[PDB]
Design a binder for this molecule. Structure first.
Ligand code: NA
Ligand code: NA
Ligand code: NA
Ligand code: NA
Lengths: 206, 206
């Protein structure tokens, strides 16, 4: 996945729809493909994450398809089924319940496969957000994956908690999150979404 | 719907795959279209019912598409998604549960829409078999019809009970079914599948 995320912009594609940022973005895609294209374990390219859908995404998708046709390209931004992706790759689409947001609806995974015109496979780029005591309903996804042939799985969010070690007054280490370093504004415990603790001890959800 | 049903044959398409019965079958389709093609209420032609899938079905489908392109043609036999139908029109396919028979599987209606290559609308030619105290789970179909755009409804089985009136020794009429006339073999109360009684009084399922 290329090092492109512009989630903080308003709207999300304010840079990725702008031709003056097309050189910057193109360097982040083309230099990744040139470095990693010989690795057999790499089977899919990604254009980045949470950057809306802009014209630069469509351009860089067509660049990768020209230079390396041996790997599908995917990209979630702008509703997860745009022309910049070969795979329908939504984040946190539910199995049976639709989430009808305005421009970017998250349809039920089962419903999304049958919308008129849609023919692509569906692989969730993020699902089953494992923040703390979580992964309720995980069996519902896997029942759906096995039953539906075009539901080909997904990628859980995520592997390891992003906590940092701080030390108390007696030098005992403790796991810290968000505003524990004086950083403000911050987003508190939301960095810790892992199936494993930061020392790689498993959570019960694993 | 043309007057063609060969459900009792083994296999079901023993006549409809046979060219020596193609003249007979062709008269039952072509004379129906010639009689009824001016009626605006007729919006879909049907090739008959429960006759497997034979080559004669594909021939008569292409005849109707040539002579009258203003109406889609459907036909359920041979698995409800053959080349003889413009609409996926299964009988008694369930909303979420698959029924994997050997040559003619009845997939879940939601799953059937997304199978690879499938692009047609889905309208059940028969569903919610109203035999007696029935129509349990009817709301599940209609939730699915409203949520899925390519699920465009279906036709309930069926309208009126097929019972006949007999009279007792004091002349009191009573509703009769299957073997009540000495007919043997017979299939008993299976003729009565209606939402209404034979005198058009409604059942509670209506
Ligand atoms: Na699958
Ligand atoms: Na997070
Ligand atoms: Na619909
Ligand atoms: Na019946």
């Amino acid at each position: 996945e290329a090092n492109i995320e512009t989630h903080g912009m308003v709207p999300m594609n304010r840079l990725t729809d702008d031709p003056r940022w097309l050189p910057a973005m193109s360097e982040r895609v083309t230099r990744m493909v040139q470095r990693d294209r010989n690795h057999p374990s790499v089977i899919i390219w990604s254009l980045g994450n949470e950057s809306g859908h802009g014209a630069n995404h469509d351009a860089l998708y067509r660049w990768i398809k020209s230079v390396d046709p041996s790997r599908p390209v995917q990209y979630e931004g702008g509703g997860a089924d745009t022309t910049a992706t070969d795979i329908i790759c939504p984040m946190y689409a539910r199995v049976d319940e639709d989430q009808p947001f305005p421009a970017v609806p998250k349809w039920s995974i089962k419903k999304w496969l049958s919308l008129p015109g849609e023919t692509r496979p569906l692989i969730l780029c993020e699902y089953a957000h494992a923040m703390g005591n979580s992964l309720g309903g995980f069996a519902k996804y896997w029942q759906a994956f096995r039953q539906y042939p075009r539901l080909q799985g997904g990628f859980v969010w995520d592997w390891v908690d992003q906590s940092l070690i701080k030390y108390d007054e007696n030098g005992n280490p403790w796991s810290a999150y968000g505003g524990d370093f004086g950083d403000t504004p911050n987003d508190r415990q939301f960095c810790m979404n892992g199936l494993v603790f930061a020392d790689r001890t498993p959570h019960p959800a694993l």
